[PDB]
Enzyme design. Sequence first.
Site, PDB file in Angstrom:
ATOM      1  N   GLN A 218       2.867   4.293 -33.697  1.00  0.00           N
ATOM      2  CA  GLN A 218       4.140   4.009 -34.358  1.00  0.00           C
ATOM      3  C   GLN A 218       5.005   5.257 -34.238  1.00  0.00           C
ATOM      4  OE1 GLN A 218       5.520   1.969 -38.419  1.00  0.00           O
ATOM      5  NE2 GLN A 218       4.209   3.756 -38.854  1.00  0.00           N
TER       6      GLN A 218
ATOM      7  N   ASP B  48      12.463   0.988 -38.707  1.00  0.00           N
ATOM      8  CA  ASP B  48      11.798   0.620 -39.948  1.00  0.00           C
ATOM      9  C   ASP B  48      12.232   1.474 -41.130  1.00  0.00           C
ATOM     10  OD1 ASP B  48      10.662   2.884 -38.833  1.00  0.00           O
ATOM     11  OD2 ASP B  48       8.593   2.314 -39.307  1.00  0.00           O
TER      12      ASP B  48
ATOM     13  N   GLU C 144       2.913  -5.339 -43.115  1.00  0.00           N
ATOM     14  CA  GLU C 144       2.519  -4.089 -43.750  1.00  0.00           C
ATOM     15  C   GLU C 144       2.971  -4.099 -45.199  1.00  0.00           C
ATOM     16  OE1 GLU C 144       4.492  -0.668 -42.085  1.00  0.00           O
ATOM     17  OE2 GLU C 144       3.032   0.721 -43.011  1.00  0.00           O
TER      18      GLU C 144
ATOM     19  N   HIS D  91       7.642  -5.179 -43.041  1.00  0.00           N
ATOM     20  CA  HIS D  91       7.243  -4.728 -44.376  1.00  0.00           C
ATOM     21  C   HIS D  91       7.268  -5.905 -45.338  1.00  0.00           C
ATOM     22  CE1 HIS D  91       9.077  -0.520 -43.365  1.00  0.00           C
ATOM     23  NE2 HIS D  91       7.826  -0.596 -42.952  1.00  0.00           N
TER      24      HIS D  91
ATOM     25  N   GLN E 244       6.885  -6.387 -36.304  1.00  0.00           N
ATOM     26  CA  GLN E 244       6.094  -6.033 -37.484  1.00  0.00           C
ATOM     27  C   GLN E 244       7.013  -5.960 -38.698  1.00  0.00           C
ATOM     28  OE1 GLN E 244       4.769  -1.857 -39.123  1.00  0.00           O
ATOM     29  NE2 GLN E 244       3.410  -2.390 -37.410  1.00  0.00           N
TER      30      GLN E 244
ATOM     31  N   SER F 105       8.594  -1.494 -36.173  1.00  0.00           N
ATOM     32  CA  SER F 105       7.321  -1.274 -36.851  1.00  0.00           C
ATOM     33  C   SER F 105       7.524  -1.316 -38.360  1.00  0.00           C
ATOM     34  CB  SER F 105       6.720   0.046 -36.398  1.00  0.00           C
ATOM     35  OG  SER F 105       7.560   1.129 -36.747  1.00  0.00           O
TER      36      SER F 105
ATOM     37  N   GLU G  24      -2.211   1.999 -39.749  1.00  0.00           N
ATOM     38  CA  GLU G  24      -1.167   2.547 -38.883  1.00  0.00           C
ATOM     39  C   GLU G  24      -0.623   3.902 -39.321  1.00  0.00           C
ATOM     40  OE1 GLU G  24       2.830   0.660 -39.403  1.00  0.00           O
ATOM     41  OE2 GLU G  24       2.736   0.515 -37.204  1.00  0.00           O
TER      42      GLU G  24
HETATM   43 CA   LIG Z   1       5.090   0.323 -40.057  1.00  0.00          CA
HETATM   44  N   LIG Z   2      -1.378   2.373 -42.658  1.00  0.00           N
END
Ligand SMILES: [Ca+2]
Ligand SMILES: [N+]
Lengths: 552, 554, 136, 136, 179, 178
Positions: free
Chosen positions: B296, B335, B170, B143, B141, B362, B221
Site C-alpha cells: 500500500q 485513501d 478495511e 474503509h 478497497q 487502498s 496491510e
Molecule cells: Ca488501506
Molecule cells: N492492517
Amino acid sequence: MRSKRFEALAKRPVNQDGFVKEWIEEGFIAMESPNDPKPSIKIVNGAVTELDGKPVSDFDLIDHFIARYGINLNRAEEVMAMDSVKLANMLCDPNVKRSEIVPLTTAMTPAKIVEVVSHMNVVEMMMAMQKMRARRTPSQQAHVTNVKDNPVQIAADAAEGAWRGFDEQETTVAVARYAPFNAIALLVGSQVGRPGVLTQCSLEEATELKLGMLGHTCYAETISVYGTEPVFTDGDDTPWSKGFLASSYASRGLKMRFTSGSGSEVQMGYAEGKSMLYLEARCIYITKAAGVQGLQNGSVSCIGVPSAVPSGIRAVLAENLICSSLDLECASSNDQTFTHSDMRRTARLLMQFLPGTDFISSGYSAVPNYDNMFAGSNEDAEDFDDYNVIQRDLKVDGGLRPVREEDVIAIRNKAARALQAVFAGMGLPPITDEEVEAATYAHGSKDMPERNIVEDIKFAQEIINKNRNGLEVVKALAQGGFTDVAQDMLNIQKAKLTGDYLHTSAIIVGDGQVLSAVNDVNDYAGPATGYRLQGERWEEIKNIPGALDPNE
Amino acid sequence: MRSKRFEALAKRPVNQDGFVKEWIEEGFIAMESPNDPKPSIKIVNGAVTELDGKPVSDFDLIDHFIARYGINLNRAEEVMAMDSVKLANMLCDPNVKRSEIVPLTTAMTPAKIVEVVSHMNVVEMMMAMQKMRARRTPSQQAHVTNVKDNPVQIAADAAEGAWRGFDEQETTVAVARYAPFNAIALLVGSQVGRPGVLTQCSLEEATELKLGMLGHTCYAETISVYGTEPVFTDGDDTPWSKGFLASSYASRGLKMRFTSGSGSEVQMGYAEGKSMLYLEARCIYITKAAGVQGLQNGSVSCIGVPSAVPSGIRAVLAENLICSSLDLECASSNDQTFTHSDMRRTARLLMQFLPGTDFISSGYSAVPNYDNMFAGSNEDAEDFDDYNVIQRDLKVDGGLRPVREEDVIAIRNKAARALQAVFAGMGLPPITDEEVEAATYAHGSKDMPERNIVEDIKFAQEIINKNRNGLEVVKALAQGGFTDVAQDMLNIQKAKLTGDYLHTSAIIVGDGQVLSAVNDVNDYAGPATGYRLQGERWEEIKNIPGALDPNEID
Amino acid sequence: ARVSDYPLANKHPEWVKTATNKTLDDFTLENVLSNKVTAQDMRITPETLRLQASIAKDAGRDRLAMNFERAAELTAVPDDRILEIYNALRPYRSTKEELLAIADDLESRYQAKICAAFVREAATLYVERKKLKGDD
Amino acid sequence: ARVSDYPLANKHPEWVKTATNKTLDDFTLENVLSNKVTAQDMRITPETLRLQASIAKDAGRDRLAMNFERAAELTAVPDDRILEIYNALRPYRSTKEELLAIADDLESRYQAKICAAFVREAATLYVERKKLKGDD
Amino acid sequence: GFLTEVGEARQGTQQDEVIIAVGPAFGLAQTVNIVGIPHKSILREVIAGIEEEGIKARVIRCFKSSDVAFVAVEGNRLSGSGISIGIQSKGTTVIHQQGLPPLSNLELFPQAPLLTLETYRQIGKNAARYAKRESPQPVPTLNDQMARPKYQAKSAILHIKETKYVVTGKNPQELRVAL
Amino acid sequence: GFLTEVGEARQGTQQDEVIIAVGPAFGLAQTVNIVGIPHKSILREVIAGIEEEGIKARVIRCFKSSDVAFVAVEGNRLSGSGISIGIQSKGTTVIHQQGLPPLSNLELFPQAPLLTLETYRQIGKNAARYAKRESPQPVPTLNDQMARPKYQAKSAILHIKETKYVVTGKNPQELRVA
Ligand SMILES: [Ca+2]
Ligand SMILES: [N+]
Ligand code: B12
Ligand code: B12
Ligand SMILES: CC[C@H]1O[C@@H](n2cnc3c(N)ncnc32)[C@H](O)[C@@H]1O
Ligand SMILES: CC[C@H]1O[C@@H](n2cnc3c(N)ncnc32)[C@H](O)[C@@H]1O
Ligand SMILES: [Ca+2]
Ligand SMILES: [K+]
Ligand SMILES: [K+]
Ligand SMILES: [N+]
C-alpha cells in the site's frame, strides 16, 4: 422506506445532470455503433468510386467533398488494408514518429480512422494526443465577455487573460450592435496584457467578416460544419460555401478555423442512424478537405448530447485525437458547461489538459461564468487557482501561470486607460476615470458602473457604417499617451501582411515571433523527448500563491 | 485597494490547502533532487559490494536488506548499463511486454529505477501502469468504519460496500478494545454482500496478528516500512523484524502487504537529504526484499507532504508505478484527505483510476467521511454516484458499479440480521430489531441508536482473552437460521488452508475463485489488448441512476 | 519556398509587399500618423499567399496550400463581391446559370481560375443533390 | 508445482491437507457443529506453503517463494513464541547472544533452519549497525 | 385530447390575426413540454395573449417539418398579418414574419426549459402587437446556464419522437381548440 | 525570552511532581505553536493545570531529541511520580509514564493544530491526576479531518528547524518560568 444513504446521493450535484440510455437506431450513441459503415475505398483512374461502403452514385455533398479533397489517395488503398488495431497501436507507440503516421492517417477514410481510434482507451488516446498534436507547445484560448458588453471591462479582462497566458481570446455580444466595441476592446486589452495575443469576435458570419476586413479582429473560429447533408443544409450552407468563406478570410490575411463537435446531427434529429463520433469524423474531413488549418471540436455547445450517453467523454477525446491525427490544429473545446459536478468536469477537462492540445480549451472563461456570453464554460475565472495548482501538482504545462495581484491590477489599469484614450481619440462615448478604476478592480460586470447603452450602440454601429478601421485605433493610441500600445497594435496588423500566422496552430509569442506547426514541429519520441515542462517555465508554474517559504 | 477578482479567488477551497516551497537540503522535494545518489552496483559472486555509490562498509540496515534480498542480481549489471531514457521508453511502450520488463526492473537498484521513471510525464506513467499492474483485472478497497464502532452499522456498510464492488475492505477502531467486534462485523457484513470479499482490521501489530490468529480477519496491510534507518529505527523496527512478521502472517494462511508512502521520512525530519521518491523507492525494495507480495503506497497518510510541493502528485503516481514495475501488488492509496478542492482531489485520483491498479484506492471510504476512522479518505460514500458516472463517461472500469436502492436496503438488512444472530448465538450484548432497522436505512452513525459501550467493550475483550475463534461465528450463524452465511464464512476460513490467496494481488471472486497475478496475468500489448471494459460488465457500468429510457416517450 | 523559408517575416521580410507595393518597413507609427500609409495599403498580396501555399505544401499540407491558392485569387475580388459569392453558394440561393456566370466572371474579370472551377463544381453537384433555387 | 497447478483449490484440492491431516472436504458445517473439526484442525501446513513457494518461483517471484519457505517453518512455532521472536528482532531489544539463542532454538526445536539463519544474519548486522540492547 | 382537425389551413381572410403553428405531435403523442408544462395550458396562454391585444388567434398543425423555424414559416405564409408563432412539442418557440429568411425571426426562444406560462402569454401578446405593426419590447426570459446541458439530450429525444410524425407533402391542418 | 536554564535537571525523589519536558527550540528559536498560540500561554496553561491538582510542575528542556515521545521519556525518568509531559515547539504533546515503552503512552495529542489553550490546561490536570494514581477521563480534542493535510507540511518544516537545535549527549536543563 427510503435509505438515507440514497437520499444523500440524491442530493449530489451530479444527479442534476442529464443522462439518457443509448438509442442506436436514431444515432443516439457516442461511438462504436453497429450502424456505422464498414471502412472501404475504391479508386479508378484517380477518382473515388466507393467510400465506406457507399457507391459514388449515392454520394451526398459531404461524400463528394471528402472523396475529392479530404483523403490522400496516394496511400488510401494501402492504409485501408492495414489492421486498424496495428494503426491504433502506432498512434500511441512512442517510437512511431508523428511524421510517419500523418501520411497514413490523412489517407484514411472517415470510417477507417474512427475504427482505429475506437480500439483505444483514454490513456492510450492521451498517449497518442501528446504526439499527434500539431504544435509542439500546448496553448490555451479564453472567452472574454460580460453581460453588459461593457468595453472597459472587456479590455481589462482581456489584459488579465493575456497576462495569465492565453494566446487566443474570444469575445461575443449580449447585444448585437455592440460588436465593434467588443472587438476593439478585446484587441486593445489583449495587446496590453501580452503583445501577440490573437483575438476574435464571434458573430453572424457576414458581420464577423466585416469586422475582420476593418482590422478589429485577428481570426475567426465559429464557422460551423456538420456531418450529414440535411443538417448542413438546414444551417443554410454546403461544404462549398464554407470552403469559399474559408478562403475569403485567408485572402484578407486572417487566420481561421471551422467549428464542429459530436452530437450536433442527432441533436437536430438527422443522424442518418450513425454514431456521433462517425459523423464528427465527417465534419473533421470536411475541414481537412476545405484546406482549413484547424478546427474547434470536442462537442463544444452540443456537449450535453455525448455526455448523456456511455463513453461520451471518451468519444470527445477521440474526436480531438482524430483532428490532430488528420494534421489539423485542434482547439479542443472544454468551453461549455455540461455538468453540475466539479469532479465530473475535471475528468472531462483532464483528457485534453494532461497530454496537451493546440488549445487545451477553446474558451476557458477568463471571467466568472455569470459574465460568460457563450452561456458558461467548463472552467471560469474562479477556477484559475485550481488550474495552476494542478499544473504544479502534475508538472503539466496547461498554458497558464500564477500571477501577482499587483501585476494584474497594473495591467488591467493600463488596458482600461488605453481604451479610455482610444475612445477619446476616436470621438466615441467617453470612458470616465471612475470606469477605469472599476474595471481595474472588478471581478465582473456586477462591479462596473452602467454605461449609456443607447449612445454606445449608435457609435459602435457607426464604426461599421463609416468603415472606421484599425489604423484609426492605432492613431488614437499614439496621440493619446500610448505610443507603446499603438506600436503593438500596428504590429498585430502587420502580421496580416505576411501570411505567417495563417498556418496550422499559429500563435504569436515573445517579440512578434510566429509559433506554428511549421516551425514548432511536434517531435515527441517518448520520455525525455518532445515538449517538456522545465527551466524558467517550470519555475513560473511552481510559483503559486500560498507556498510557504521554509526560510521564513 | 484589493482586486475583487483576487478576493473571489481567495475564497476558493483550494487556497485552504497547505503548500510549501522546496527545501532540497532537507529532503523537502518530491522527486528529481540533485542530492539523490547516482545509480551504481558492484556484485562479487552474488554479493553486492556497492549500491548506488555506497560501498558495503557504509551500508545501513536498509542497504543491507535491499542488497541481499531486494534486487535481481542476475541482470543487475546489464540493466545498470542501459540508458535510463531508453528504459523509461520501454516502460510505456505498448510493444515491450511486461514479462520482458520485469526481469530488468527487478534488477534495477533503487536509484536506477527512480532515475528511469523520473524521465516520464504523468501520461507516460499511466500508459506504463496499465501494463505493469500485476493483476489483469483492476479492483478497489474500501474503509468501513464509524465514530461509534457500531458493529451493526459496520456489518451493514460492509455489505453495501461488497455489493458495490469492493473486493477488499478495511476497518479500524475509535475505541481500541472494540476491535474484535469491528472485525467480526466487517467479516460477516462483507460475506453477506459478496462471498469472497477479504477483510482486515488495522490495529497495533500484536493485537492485529492475534485477531488474525483467531480467524476474525483475512489479511493485514498497515505493517509499515520506512526509507531511512533513523526513521525505521524510530518506528521501533528493522527490515528483519518486519520481514519476520510478514512470514508469520503467511505461516497462519493470512495474506498481507506492507504500507509505505512518499514523505514519511522528511515528515519525521530524517530524510538524509534525499527526495521523497528516492526514499519511497527504498521502501518499495524493502517490501520486495522481505518477500511480501504487495504494498500500500502512494504517500497514504503522509499525502500532505508530497502534495504541498511541486510535482508531488506526479511523484505519487511514480511511486505506484515503481511498485508495480517491481512486480508487487499495488494498493495505490487514494485513501486519505489532502485537499479542500473537488477539482484537485479528482485529478489526484485519476492518475490511478484511469490506467487501473490492483486496488485503485487502498481505502475508498464506504461511509461518509465523518464516520471515517482513518480521519477521512480522498473519496467517500457521497462520491459513489460521481465515481460511477465517470466510469461510464470514460469507459473505465474503476472496480465499482451502480446499484439499486432496494437491493442495498435488502443486503444491509440481511447483514444486520446476520450479525444480530451472531451476537445472540455467542452471547454478546444483543442487537435489537430497532438497531437492525436503523442500520438498514442509515447513511452513517448519526442515524444509529447509541449502544452500551461499556458492555460491548467487556464482551469484545473476552473474545481475545478467551480465544473465541471464527468457528464460533460460523456456529452461531448456522444455529440462528443463517445457514448460507455460515457456509460462506466457513468457505473464507477454508481459503486460508490452501495458500492460494497469499499470492501477488489475490482476491476471491465468483464462487470461491481466487483471482491473483498468477492466474489473472496482465497481458497488455496496446490498443484492443489486456483488460478491456466490455460485455456484461460494461452493461453493468452503463446502468447509472437517472438515465432516461427513450421508450418512456410516446 | 520551403519550410526553412518560414516565417517570411523572419526569413524573407523583403519578399512581403502589399497590394499597393509598400514594404513591411513602411508601416511605422510615423507613416500611419501622417497618412503616408493607409488601410488600402494594408492588404496581403497574391504573391505572399502563393508563397505560403508553397510552404504549406512543403510542410505536407497540400489541401491547406490549395486554400491559400484560392485565397491568392480572391485578394483581387472586392469586399462586397466576396460576400455575394459566398451567399450565392448557399443552398437554394442560385440557379445553375447564375453560378456558372459567377465562375465565368471570376475567371475573366479576376483571373480567379481555381475559384472559378470550384464554383462550377458546386453548380454541377448542386444539380445532382437538388440544392439550386427552386429545389426546396 | 508450476503456475499450471495453481490455484491448488481448483487444480489439486486433494493436495491440501491440514496440520492434523484433515482434507478440505472434512470442513463442513456439520463437522464444525459436531466439533469433529476445530480451530486446531484449521491450520495451513508447511507442505502447502512449500507448494505455493514452488508456484511463486515458477511465476518468477523468488523472494515471495522465500517468504513462503520461512512461513512453512513458522507453522510449527506457537502463537506466543511468534510474537516473542518478532519483538526480540526490534532494535535495542536483544543482545547478540539472545538473538543467537533464538536462532539455535528455532533450528533445534522447530527445524526452522531458514528462519534461524535469518535471525543470525540480523544479529550480525545489528552488531555492525549498533541496534542491539545497550546501543541506544 | 383537445385539438381537432377541421380541414386544410387556408390563407388568412383578415389582416388582424396571428397563426400559432404547432408541430406534428403537439397535443397528441406528446402532451407536455420539456419540463412538464401541459400543451393545453401553453396553447391557452398563447391564444389569450393574442386575444388580449384584440387580435384573432388561429391554430394550425404542420406536418412537413418538426423544425420550429420551418413550422413557423408554414404559419407565416398563411397568416393574414404575416405573423406566426411556431411551437414544438418540447416547447421551443419562435415569432416569425412572412418575408423573413426561414432561419431569421422576430423573436426566438431557444431554451425551452426556461419558458413559463407567463412567457407563453407574453409571446402571444408580442406577436399580436407585431401584427398591429407595433414594436413591443422583446419578451424576457430568465437565464439558467445549467438548463442547456441538463435538458439537451432529453430535448433531442423529444424532437426525434415528434419528427416521426412528419408527413412529407402533407398540407397544414387548421385546428379547433377545445374549451 | 521567558525561559532560563538553572543547571542540569535533578531527578524527582517523591511522587509529588509532574515534569514538563519541552523541545530544544521551545521558547528560543520558536515562540508559537503550529497555529500561532504562544509558548508562554501554552506553558502557563499546563503549569496552571498541574498546580491546580496540588502537584508541583517542573519544567525542563531536552536536547537529545526533538521527538515528542523521546523528549517525554527523558522527562518521566526524572519525574518523582513517573509522569511527564512532552511538548515540541510546533505544539505536539504527550502524557508519558516511566516504565512504558517509549512509543507507548498514557495520552497522545498527535494533531497539534487541534489544540487550544483549554486543552493545554486540561492536559495538565489529567497529567497531575495520573501522578495521584487516579484514573482521569481522556482529554477531548476537536475533530477536523482537513487539519492534518492542511498543516502537515508546515509542521514538518517547524520540526526540522527545531531538530537543528538538538545537542547530542546533552542532559535536560531545568528552566524558570515567568
Ligand atoms: Ca488501506
Ligand atoms: N492492517
Ligand atoms: C445547441 C445550439 C445549436 C445546435 C442544435 C440546433 C438544433 N436545431 O438542434 C447546432 C450546433 C446544431 C445549432 C445550429 C444552428 N444554430 Co444554434 N444554437 C444552439 C445554442 C448554443 C443552444 C440552444 C440549446 O441548447 N438550448 C437548450 C435546449 C434544452 O432547449 P431547446 O429549446 O430544445 O433548444 C433548441 C433550439 O435552441 C434549437 N436551435 C438551436 N440553434 C438554432 C437556431 C435557429 C435559427 C432555430 C430556429 C433553432 C435553433 O436547437 C435546440 C435543440 O433542439 C443556441 C445559443 C443560445 N443562446 O440559446 C444557439 C442559437 C439558437 N443558434 C443559432 C444559430 C444562428 C444557428 C444556425 C442557423 C447556425 C448556422 N448558420 O449553421 C443553426 C440553425 C440550425 C437549425 N436549422 O435549427 C442562434 C440563433 C439566432 C436567432 N435568434 O435566430 C443562437 C441563438 C446562437 C446565437 N447567439 O447566435 N445550434
Ligand atoms: C502521519 C502519521 C505518522 C507519520 C509521521 C510521524 C512523525 N513522527 O513525523 C509516520 C507514517 C512516519 C508515522 C509513524 C508512526 N506512527 Co503515526 N500517525 C500519523 C497520523 C496518521 C497523522 C498525524 C498528523 O499528521 N497530524 C497532523 C499534524 C499537523 O500534527 P502534528 O502534531 O505535527 O502531528 C505529528 C505527530 O502526530 C507525530 N506522530 C505521528 N505518529 C506518531 C506516533 C507516535 C507514537 C508519536 C509519539 C508521535 C507521532 O507526527 C506528526 C508530524 O510530525 C496519526 C493519526 C492521528 N490520529 O493523528 C498517526 C499516529 C499518531 N501514529 C501512530 C503510530 C502507532 C505510529 C508508529 C509508532 C507506527 C510504527 N510502529 O511504525 C510510528 C511512530 C514514529 C515516531 N517515532 O514518531 C498512532 C499513535 C498511537 C498512540 N496513541 O500511541 C497514531 C495515532 C495512528 C493510529 N492509527 O493509532 N505516523
Ligand atoms: C448555434 C450554432 C453555432 O454554434 C456553434 N457550435 C457550437 N457547437 C457546435 C457543434 N458541435 N457543431 C457545429 N457548430 C457548433 C457554431 O458557431 C454554430 O454556428
Ligand atoms: C501512524 C503510522 C502508521 O500509518 C500507516 N501509514 C500511513 N502512511 C504511511 C507512510 N507513508 N509510510 C509508512 N506508514 C504509513 C502505517 O500503518 C503506520 O504503521
Ligand atoms: Ca472558442
Ligand atoms: K458533428
Ligand atoms: K516512504
Ligand atoms: N468566430
